[PDB]
């Protein structure tokens, strides 16, 4: 049963990802999030290794939820006549990065460095587990405010990672790359790097760099805030118009701006506590 295993609390939010409620696991008081997604609202279906038909979101979450990582882990799931219910980790206290940036404005580079590094490690984890998220953005990143740890959420736009071209996309448009906008074609890793460029700009400038399609394909990055030249360079590199001119994850992590990152705990001590 579901309602005997979890004590449901208040609604935490709702949107494209479904509706998510605060919850606690009765058996040990572990805080959880209880996410409900209507079946009629799910367009991407997959199958478990044992061949059950589940949302692709569940398939991808299982693939990345083994062992420790910077991803919010799937702890369990249930099928209902008209919906699926997903039981997910819930850090406490917690705030999503969009809300955090909205509140605090542009982030100091030291904090952006630590956050961006954790997001890169998390996205590497997903790719290594065969999962492409396709909707990396500030709204899909949770911050554990006491531990200083960032966690990825919302795989409902994701796909199994592959080496061939993707011709479908339902993630967030202003984070999508110019090759998608123009040709409706992209490859997974280089499109991911583009979204990470958008995210890094957002962190250090307090807002995203592009709004309209013609801005995305023009790819001119204007800085509205004071940003170091090394950070500017890395951002412009991730936002290269040609996918092949973009850095690899290895190249991003070896870039001079990414050196000497704070650990999560010191990040929280300095910036979040």
Author numbering: 33 to 305
Task: Give the article text.
Pim kinases are interesting targets for cancer therapy as they are overexpressed in various human cancers, associated with metastasis, and overall treatment response. Here we now wish to report such a novel cyclometalated protein kinase inhibitor scaffold based on 1,8-phenanthrolin-7(8 H)-one cyclometalated with the half-sandwich moiety [Ru(η5-C5H5)(CO)] in a bidentate fashion. In conclusion, we here introduced a new organometallic protein kinase inhibitor scaffold based on a cyclometalated 1,8-phenanthrolin-7(8 H)-one ligand.
Because of the structural homology of the isoforms Pim1 and Pim2 and our experience with the crystallization of Pim1,[15, 19, 21b, 22b] we cocrystallized 1 with the protein kinase Pim1. The structure of the Pim1/1 complex was determined and refined to a resolution of 1.95 Å. Another hydrogen bond is observed between the carbonyl group of organometallic 1 and the ammonium moiety of the conserved Lys67, an amino acid residue that directly interacts with the α-phosphate of ATP during phospho transfer catalysis. Related non-hinge hydrogen-bonding interactions have been observed with organic Pim1 inhibitors. Thus, the cyclometalated 1,8-phenanthrolin-7(8 H)-one 1 may constitute an attractive scaffold for the design of protein kinase inhibitors with novel properties.
